[PDB]
Structures are given as structure tokens and as C-alpha cells.
Design a binder for this molecule. Sequence first.
Ligand SMILES: *[C@@H]1O[C@H](CO)[C@@H](O)[C@H](O)[C@H]1NC(C)=O
Ligand SMILES: *[C@@H]1O[C@H](CO)[C@@H](O)[C@H](O)[C@H]1NC(C)=O
Ligand SMILES: *[C@@H]1O[C@H](CO)[C@@H](O)[C@H](O)[C@H]1NC(C)=O
Ligand SMILES: *[C@@H]1O[C@H](CO)[C@@H](O)[C@H](O)[C@H]1NC(C)=O
Lengths: 51, 109, 171, 171, 171
Amino acid sequence: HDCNTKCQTPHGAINSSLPFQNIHPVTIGECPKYVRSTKLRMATGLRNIPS
Amino acid sequence: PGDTICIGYHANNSTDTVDTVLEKNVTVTHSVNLLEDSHNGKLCKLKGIAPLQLGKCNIAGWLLGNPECDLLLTASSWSYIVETSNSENGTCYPGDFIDYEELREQLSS
Amino acid sequence: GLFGAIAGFIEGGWTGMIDGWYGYHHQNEQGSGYAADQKSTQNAIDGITNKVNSVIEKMNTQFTAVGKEFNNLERRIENLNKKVDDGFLDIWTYNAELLVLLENERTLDFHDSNVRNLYEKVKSQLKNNAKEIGNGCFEFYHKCDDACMESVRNGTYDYPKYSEESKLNRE
Amino acid sequence: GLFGAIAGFIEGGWTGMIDGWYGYHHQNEQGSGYAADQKSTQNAIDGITNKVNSVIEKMNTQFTAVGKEFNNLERRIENLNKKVDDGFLDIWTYNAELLVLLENERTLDFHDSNVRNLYEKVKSQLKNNAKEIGNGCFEFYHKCDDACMESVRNGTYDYPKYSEESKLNRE
Amino acid sequence: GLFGAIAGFIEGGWTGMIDGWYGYHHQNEQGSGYAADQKSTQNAIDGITNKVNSVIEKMNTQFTAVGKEFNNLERRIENLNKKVDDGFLDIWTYNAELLVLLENERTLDFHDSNVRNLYEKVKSQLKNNAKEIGNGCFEFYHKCDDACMESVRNGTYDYPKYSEESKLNRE
Ligand SMILES: *[C@@H]1O[C@H](CO)[C@@H](O)[C@H](O)[C@H]1NC(C)=O
Ligand SMILES: *[C@@H]1O[C@H](CO)[C@@H](O)[C@H](O)[C@H]1NC(C)=O
Ligand SMILES: *[C@@H]1O[C@H](CO)[C@@H](O)[C@H](O)[C@H]1NC(C)=O
Ligand SMILES: *[C@@H]1O[C@H](CO)[C@@H](O)[C@H](O)[C@H]1NC(C)=O
């Protein structure tokens, strides 16, 4: 389709400034590093204790 | 019944969870995802240049000008080359395409 | 936690404090309310933002990295390519998952530290003009109005001013 | 240590407490003995077990993976292979050694934190009904029998019940 | 800092203390001066030296590694070589930068911890023979000459000797 991207994979293009991705090891262009992780979430705030 | 001041910390309705070294499934008030798992399901341009679609032809079929690939005769510029699952037309006369993989790597340039 | 405060001697969090990560709840004749500590909160926000940004910033993007193709007389080099790609994948996946684990622990501990330091700061400001309950709260031995409370919050509480009155009421 | 307790103001450990990582030794009129603090010990065990398991778990197995062979006009690709294997060896050896170093430090520090926090927890229950010796021990200003001791250990100590008596012996 | 002492309740450092990382300033009738704590300073120096040495020590040197060359029909393997070299460069640069960031934070926090622990050491030696000012200072309720000060500096302070004078002056 006529879209623009920095990063293309065989499943579709990725548009992200994130360091890692789990979509595909094959990439063309300027992409995140491929890893096998299914989640990578950094805490910013604290333990949530509403109780 | 005297005046009071308390020291305390934030809570909210966030359901975000993170894993830590000592403990799994910790609910936290705020967090940021570092892992992209979403894509748009499309083939897009790179450097504002469209890819080349070989369609039912492959690179051999294209370059040699396999007669089924006549629709590719007008193709002129691209950011990357796309073969699809129906690209079956290449060398219609049987034999070997020498240094074909090298030529393919070169041609992407 | 490492510093013993969050989920520690201060048992739970405050859904009523919407304007900060850490802060104060007060009760007096004049009323009741929550207030964020701006200094510690802003320092923590800046620090943690710098941490996340610093993790992401160190990842120069993956520029073109493409699969190599191979003919039927190239199994060894195809396998070399697959070994390299798999090896790099093992390394980056292990490091990213483990790094996120470790950094999450450090972040939570950082918050615990900030809460402990705010509590001990108030404790050391007030000294014996108030009694520590133990649950993060202080009960004043003297009347402490809104201005006084604010003096506590901005670190200008005047201990000698209320010391005599406090000594009188404490006994 | 970072938190000052283990190998700190508490110079040494107790070979007589065989049933937990942390706990209490008491002496009173009914007799004398050790008892592990079950909660902190179990929390630490679970945490550390999770740490070790998380280190091991992140090494997705190496599926069948082998060395490559090369003919006499393939020295360059053989050397590429060797460069890859050696490079991976450098990365994994450095990372494993350094990771083990840093995590060992963290584990020891985690224990130090748990001891300090247990001590301050007891301290905050007892307040001035006991005097701090300084070596991790508290001396009561009131009689404290076995039930009382257990109340101290499980965080149900009744400060008001013994406050007047304590006040009597303290003065 | 994490432990609240350096850039914390002790607001600034001492350009007048030239002989150690941590220590004491005293003032009495006999005179005034700074003195480094040798034991804690040397322990910290040894620790940090071991950390730096351990970082450098884990990089067994890179023996000969030279660029490989390729002809015009070897572009794919040339690109494999480039992928390998770039992949290793990305990994080592990211790891070195991130490691230096994290370890620098840990080092600063380590210093903060050592100052806090030194402060609590003095506090626990002196007990109620002095009042905590709050800025890292203690005011004696008794006269404390050079020998007494030195007992504090070397961790041999005698609470009962000055206890009586202190109790008298405190009231
Ligand atoms: C959770 O609470 C916040 C604060 O009011 C609110 O903005 C948000 O809508 C809530 N969650 C929902 C219903 O999406
Ligand atoms: C802190 O609070 C008092 C009470 O009103 C106020 O007068 C004073 O200006 C404040 N101090 C600071 C930090 O500006
Ligand atoms: C703790 O011990 C006291 C004294 O025996 C007892 O009354 C109380 O029920 C105990 N609490 C718990 C947590 O079981
Ligand atoms: C501590 O100070 C006293 C008095 O100056 C001195 O006699 C003693 O040698 C010192 N003790 C230690 C352990 O250094």
C-alpha cells in the first residue's frame, strides 16, 4: 500500500522507536533488534498497593 | 485527638505488571513497554521509495524477460524487491542460472 | 523492599494523592488532605526517565540486516549464517529479559528508598515536638496549622518555636 | 555490608538456629531458646530461588548445534567460523563472570537488608519498653514470658499492656 | 543518594579533609581538626579497586583478528562477515556503556552507604551522651577532650565514664 516506513518485515511494516521486537528476525530498513521475548516491560513507578 | 501528618506513597487503578528478579507478576502504578509486537500487515516504502513487485514472476523471469513477466517491463526504481508465493515463472527453458544468488544480492543494490 | 518502607512499615498506597509519587496526608482542626512532595517526586521522575531513555538510546537502530540466500551446494555457509543469527538472538534475548528483571528490581528499590528518606527526613525535622505512630504518621504534641504543615512540607519547620508548647502538652 | 547489619553492628551468625535463615534467640524465667522467623526466611528463600531459576531459565536450550568442516581453499570461511565461535565465547564468558559477580553482591546485600529490617521491625514494636543493647539484642524493662516473646516474634506484642510496668522499672 | 547521607542530611563534602574518603571533624578546647577514618576508607578503597580490576581483568585480550577479503562473486559471504562484525560491535558497545552506567550508580550509592553506616556507628557509640544535631554532627553533654575524641575515632568510646557528667549536664 502506499505508506512509508523506516522498518519492513515480511508480516508487515513496523513503526516503533522501541529497542526490541518479536515480530520477525528478517527485516529491511531501520528496525528494532529482534528477540524471542514475548514481553519486556520496565517499571517506572512503584509497587501498586491500593488494597 | 491531636493534629497529624503522614508520609505515604502513590497507588492507582493501573493493572500493569512487571517481572522482577525476586518476584513475578508485580502490579505497578506506571511502566513502559520496550518490546514491539505490532505491525501493520502491509509492505511499505523505504526511504520514500516503493518496493518492486515481481508478482507471478521471479527475478530470473523478470531479468531474462520470461514472456509471462511482460507486465514487469515498465518497472524502473525501488527500495527493496518483493517476491510472493505465486512467483513461479523464471527460467522456462530448463537449466541452471549461474551465480543467481550473488546476482540477487547485487541487484538489491 | 530493600529499604523497608513501601509494603513495609508504611503498609499501603494512597489513591487520594493524585499529583505525585510520594507525599503527605495531614489532619488538623482546619481540615484534612493529601499533598505531593515536589522535590523528591521530580528528582525520581527525572532519574527514572533518564534510566529508561538511557536504556533505549544505547540501541542504535538495526539498519538493514537481511537474510542470505543459498544454493544446494552451500549447506555449510547457510548453517554458518543460521548459527550467527541464532547466536546473536540467544544473546540479545537473554540480556534483554534478564536486564529488565534486574532493572525492575532496582527501580522498585529506588522508590522504597525515596519513601524511607522522606519519612526519616520528617522524623528528623520534627524530633520530639511530635510522636511517631509507626505507620508513617506523626501526631503533633502542639497545635500545627496549615502554615506550619506547609513549613514541614517545604523543609522549613521551626522546631524551637513549637518546642516549649510541645514540652508542655507532652507532659 | 550496604545495610550495616551482617558483619556489621551484629558481628556474627548463630550456628544454633538450624531451622531458618533469620530469627530470634531469647532468655527468660521459663527457659532459653532459638526460633526462626518464618516469614522473612521464606520470603528470602522464595526470592533467591526465583533469582537462580530466572538465571537458568533464560538459557533457552541450544538445539542440536555443530562445528563446520572446510577444504584447503576455504581458509577464509573457516576463519570466519572461528571468529564467530571465539567471539561468542568472549561475550558469554565475560557476561557470565561479571553477572555472577554483581548478582552475588546483590544477594549478600539482600540478606543484609532483610536482617536490618527485621531488627528495626522488632525495635519499632517494642519502642521504650526495652533498651537496645546494640548487638541486635533488646532487654525488657518488664517481665516477658514465653507467650509474650512469641507475641513479639509474630508482631502482636501489646505495648500498652506492659507500658506501665516498663515505665516502673525504667525509672 | 539512595541512603540519604551524601548530598543528603550531610549537605556537602570537606575540601579540608585531604587524607581520606570518610571521616570526622571535631572541635574542642584543645583545638580543631579533620581526621579520616582509616578502616572504612581502606575497606572502600579495596572494594572499588577489586571492582575496577575485575572489570578490566575479564577481558582476556583479543588475539589476532583481521579483516577477511572477498571477490566480486562473494558478496553474500562478505555481507555475512560484515553482519558478524557489526553484530559484535553493537553488543560490546551497548554492554560496555550500559554496564558503566549501572556500576557508576552502584559505586556512588556504595559511598553513600559507607557514610551512613559510619554515622550510625558514631551514633550508637555515643548514645544519649550526645544530641544529634542532624547535619552529621553530635553535641556532647560532657566535655570531650583529645583522648575521648580519639576513642570515638578508633571505636573505643567509653559510655559509662562520661555518662554521669552527661546526665548531669543534660538535665
Ligand atoms: C482509573 O482511574 C483514573 C483516575 O480517575 C481514570 O482517569 C481512569 O479512567 C480509570 N480507569 C478507567 C475507567 O479507564
Ligand atoms: C515554607 O512554608 C512557609 C509557611 O507559609 C512559607 O512562609 C515559606 O516561604 C516556605 N519556605 C520556602 C521553602 O519557600
Ligand atoms: C502471636 O502470639 C501471640 C501470643 O501467643 C498470640 O496471642 C497471637 O495469636 C499470635 N499471632 C499470630 C500471628 O498467630
Ligand atoms: C583509641 O584511643 C585511645 C585513646 O587515645 C588509644 O589509647 C587507643 O590506642 C585507641 N584504640 C584503638 C583500638 O586504636
